[PDB]
Design an enzyme around this catalytic site. Structure first.
Site, PDB file in Angstrom:
ATOM      1  N   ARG A  45       2.234   2.237  -6.761  1.00  0.00           N
ATOM      2  CA  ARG A  45       1.632   1.442  -5.708  1.00  0.00           C
ATOM      3  C   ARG A  45       0.426   2.128  -5.081  1.00  0.00           C
ATOM      4  NH1 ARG A  45       2.431  -0.730   0.283  1.00  0.00           N
ATOM      5  NH2 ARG A  45       2.293  -2.981  -0.211  1.00  0.00           N
ATOM      6  N   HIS A  49      -3.272   0.543  -4.794  1.00  0.00           N
ATOM      7  CA  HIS A  49      -3.845   0.369  -3.473  1.00  0.00           C
ATOM      8  C   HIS A  49      -5.210   1.035  -3.240  1.00  0.00           C
ATOM      9  CE1 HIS A  49      -1.104  -1.629  -0.344  1.00  0.00           C
ATOM     10  NE2 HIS A  49      -0.861  -2.177  -1.536  1.00  0.00           N
ATOM     11  N   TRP A 188      13.425  -6.149  -6.466  1.00  0.00           N
ATOM     12  CA  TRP A 188      13.138  -7.298  -7.312  1.00  0.00           C
ATOM     13  C   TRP A 188      14.073  -7.355  -8.506  1.00  0.00           C
ATOM     14  CZ3 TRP A 188       9.156  -4.388  -5.224  1.00  0.00           C
ATOM     15  CH2 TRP A 188       8.176  -5.060  -4.499  1.00  0.00           C
TER      16      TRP A 188
HETATM   17  C1  CCH Z   1       0.342  -2.840 -10.556  1.00  0.00           C
HETATM   18  C2  CCH Z   1       0.765  -2.558  -9.337  1.00  0.00           C
HETATM   19  C3  CCH Z   1       1.113  -3.649  -8.328  1.00  0.00           C
HETATM   20  C4  CCH Z   1       0.541  -4.830  -8.123  1.00  0.00           C
HETATM   21  C5  CCH Z   1      -0.724  -5.364  -8.838  1.00  0.00           C
HETATM   22  C6  CCH Z   1       1.062  -5.324  -6.871  1.00  0.00           C
HETATM   23  C7  CCH Z   1       0.629  -6.471  -6.241  1.00  0.00           C
HETATM   24  C8  CCH Z   1       1.244  -7.018  -5.138  1.00  0.00           C
HETATM   25  N1  CCH Z   1       2.089  -6.390  -4.243  1.00  0.00           N
HETATM   26 FE1  CCH Z   1       3.065  -4.772  -4.859  1.00  0.00          FE
HETATM   27  N2  CCH Z   1       4.020  -2.974  -5.243  1.00  0.00           N
HETATM   28  C9  CCH Z   1       4.023  -2.357  -6.470  1.00  0.00           C
HETATM   29  C10 CCH Z   1       3.037  -2.423  -7.410  1.00  0.00           C
HETATM   30  C11 CCH Z   1       2.171  -3.490  -7.367  1.00  0.00           C
HETATM   31  N3  CCH Z   1       2.175  -4.568  -6.512  1.00  0.00           N
HETATM   32  C12 CCH Z   1       5.064  -1.353  -6.505  1.00  0.00           C
HETATM   33  C13 CCH Z   1       5.396  -0.535  -7.770  1.00  0.00           C
HETATM   34  C14 CCH Z   1       5.742  -1.446  -5.361  1.00  0.00           C
HETATM   35  C15 CCH Z   1       7.062  -0.790  -4.957  1.00  0.00           C
HETATM   36  C16 CCH Z   1       6.817   0.351  -3.970  1.00  0.00           C
HETATM   37  C17 CCH Z   1       8.069   1.044  -3.513  1.00  0.00           C
HETATM   38  O1  CCH Z   1       9.127   0.768  -4.140  1.00  0.00           O
HETATM   39  O2  CCH Z   1       7.909   1.846  -2.547  1.00  0.00           O
HETATM   40  C18 CCH Z   1       5.126  -2.500  -4.573  1.00  0.00           C
HETATM   41  C19 CCH Z   1       5.527  -2.994  -3.362  1.00  0.00           C
HETATM   42  C20 CCH Z   1       4.979  -4.108  -2.763  1.00  0.00           C
HETATM   43  C21 CCH Z   1       5.258  -4.365  -1.371  1.00  0.00           C
HETATM   44  C22 CCH Z   1       6.432  -3.665  -0.658  1.00  0.00           C
HETATM   45  C23 CCH Z   1       6.010  -2.728   0.493  1.00  0.00           C
HETATM   46  C24 CCH Z   1       7.135  -1.992   1.190  1.00  0.00           C
HETATM   47  O3  CCH Z   1       7.379  -0.830   0.761  1.00  0.00           O
HETATM   48  O4  CCH Z   1       7.731  -2.587   2.143  1.00  0.00           O
HETATM   49  C25 CCH Z   1       4.589  -5.477  -1.029  1.00  0.00           C
HETATM   50  C26 CCH Z   1       4.747  -6.360   0.222  1.00  0.00           C
HETATM   51  C27 CCH Z   1       3.736  -5.832  -2.124  1.00  0.00           C
HETATM   52  C28 CCH Z   1       2.807  -6.849  -1.977  1.00  0.00           C
HETATM   53  C29 CCH Z   1       2.100  -7.149  -3.114  1.00  0.00           C
HETATM   54  C30 CCH Z   1       1.169  -8.250  -3.269  1.00  0.00           C
HETATM   55  C31 CCH Z   1       0.825  -9.277  -2.172  1.00  0.00           C
HETATM   56  C32 CCH Z   1       0.582  -8.084  -4.453  1.00  0.00           C
HETATM   57  C33 CCH Z   1      -0.549  -8.845  -5.140  1.00  0.00           C
HETATM   58  O5  CCH Z   1      -0.666 -10.032  -4.914  1.00  0.00           O
HETATM   59  N4  CCH Z   1       3.919  -4.927  -3.162  1.00  0.00           N
END
Ligand code: CCH
Length: 291
Positions: A45, A49, A188
């Site tokens: 992430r 970001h 998820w």
């Molecule tokens: C290729 C990478 C990627 C894409 C692209 C991508 C695109 C999207 N994401 Fe994402 N993301 C990951 C990789 C990717 N995401 C990953 C992996 C996580 C998990 C992080 C964790 O487990 O701490 C992860 C967590 C969240 C969170 C959780 C935050 C929390 O910790 O509370 C949100 C909300 C969220 C919102 C969106 C949205 C909106 C979008 C696009 O529309 N993402």
């Protein structure tokens, strides 16, 4: 604005492989993180970001500058929780001070994916730290309470098409949402620290119920105990997205190939690689090295 990739003075592949290995070893070691999920997900992430701030219109943002290191970007609300990934990398930087920030942040994402059994993601070095002044303003990252239209439009700013968007979204198989961070709570899927096409499978096979969460936000909840964001959900609401989703649900190999290409592209957006720049490197995992 032109960002030319400039290789860290006198460094070679072997030099990179070491940074990789260090990150990899630390992932292996710090396994207790987030109720035993590990830091893999958070690193993926972070890389996304620091890269999603890019704006194809004026070339501002993107991974090049390592701007996340600055307060403005660092404190971005959409960035909540990323600090754990930073803190994780900090000692690594200390160990390899010659690496640029953008190169480090992006490399951790690549390391994470590959060590979590994902596909091999070719990577390029050459990112250059830029001044505090080049830190993009907050507000460039996507909102989660939206739909397919929003998503299509959003992703366009980064030059990603339908296929790229769906591939990229499969990163959601990893980690989970955290109430305190984003106002969403739950994973998820089941194998949250192993890279698979689980996301698609879940989206297509569970019986999802829209509900409000403790933060007063809607999310799709499954009996299995999984969740999906509105934006995630939208991938089945859109006709074009939906058939890609199905294709990935059906062929993990396809998914992996597409993911690999899109992720690299995502991490290389806004950067110009001179003719004489080295080819992209494909790092060996710990296991491939017998480490
Ligand atoms: C290729 C990478 C990627 C894409 C692209 C991508 C695109 C999207 N994401 Fe994402 N993301 C990951 C990789 C990717 N995401 C990953 C992996 C996580 C998990 C992080 C964790 O487990 O701490 C992860 C967590 C969240 C969170 C959780 C935050 C929390 O910790 O509370 C949100 C909300 C969220 C919102 C969106 C949205 C909106 C979008 C696009 O529309 N993402």
């Amino acid at each position: 604005l032109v960002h030319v990739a400039s290789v860290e003075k006198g460094r070679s592949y072997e030099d990179f492989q070491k940074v990789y290995n260090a990150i990899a070893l630390k992932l292996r070691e710090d396994d207790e993180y987030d109720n035993y999920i590990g830091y893999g997900p958070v690193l993926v992430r972070l890389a996304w970001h620091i890269s999603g701030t890019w704006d194809k219109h004026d070339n501002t943002g993107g991974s090049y500058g390592g701007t996340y290191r600055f307060k403005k970007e660092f404190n971005d609300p959409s960035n909540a929780g990323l600090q754990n990934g930073f803190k994780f990398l900090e000692p690594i930087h200390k160990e390899f001070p010659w690496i640029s920030s953008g190169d480090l942040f992006s490399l951790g994402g690549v390391t994470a994916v590959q060590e979590m059994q994902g596909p091999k993601i070719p990577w390029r070095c050459g990112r250059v730290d830029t001044p505090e002044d080049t830190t993009p303003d907050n507000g460039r990252l996507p909102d989660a309470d939206k739909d397919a239209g929003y998503v299509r439009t959003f992703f366009q700013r980064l030059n990603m098409n339908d296929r790229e968007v769906v591939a990229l979204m499969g990163a959601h198989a990893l980690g989970k949402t955290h109430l305190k961070n984003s106002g969403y709570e739950g994973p998820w899927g089941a194998a949250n620290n192993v890279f698979t096409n689980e996301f698609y499978l879940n989206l297509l096979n569970e019986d999802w119920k829209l509900e409000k969460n403790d933060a007063n936000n809607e999310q799709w909840d499954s009996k299995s105990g999984y969740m999906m964001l509105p934006t995630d959900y939208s991938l089945i609401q859109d006709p074009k997205y939906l058939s890609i989703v199905k294709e990935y649900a059906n062929d993990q190999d396809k998914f992996f190939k597409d993911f690999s290409k899109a992720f690299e592209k995502l991490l290389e957006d806004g950067i110009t690689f001179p003719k004489d720049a080295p080819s992209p490197f494909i790092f060996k995992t710990l296991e491939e090295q017998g480490l």
